[PDB]
Amino acid sequence: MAEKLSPNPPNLTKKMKKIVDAVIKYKDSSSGRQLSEVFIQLPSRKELPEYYELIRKPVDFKKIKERIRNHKYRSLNDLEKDVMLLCQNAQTFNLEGSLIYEDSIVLQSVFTSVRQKIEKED
């Protein structure tokens, strides 16, 4: 099947993984809820058919991680786009003010600050 992609510069792959790991690890300081936890693994098309009806380009953090390992992302812009899509998809499928919709909003901000921090190191 698929033809292997040229590996990214390793430093770029390490930056990608660092950023997504901080995002995934992030905790609401009050509840300790890992905001990411519901976004790790999207539910099956068999279990939640209506999801895949409204959301044409679904994405979870498992796929984002896969896409980093496979060098599908060629830049941090490419990674960011997919995390922002993850958050947009949440905001489309869930009603505003809901736990999942508002958590996705916070995760955008955590991505942005985490990215900045990591890029400011080099």
Author numbering: 1447 to 1568
Recite the paper's sentences:
Bromodomains (BRDs) are protein interaction modules that specifically recognize ε-N-lysine acetylation motifs, a key event in the reading process of epigenetic marks. The 61 BRDs in the human genome cluster into eight families based on structure/sequence similarity. The four helices form a deep cavity that is extended by the two loop regions (ZA and BC loops), creating a largely hydrophobic Kac binding pocket.
The most notable structural difference within the BRD core fold is a hairpin insertion located between helix αZ and the ZA loop that is present in all family VIII members. The proximity to the Kac binding site suggests that this insert may play a role in recruitment of acetylated binding partners.
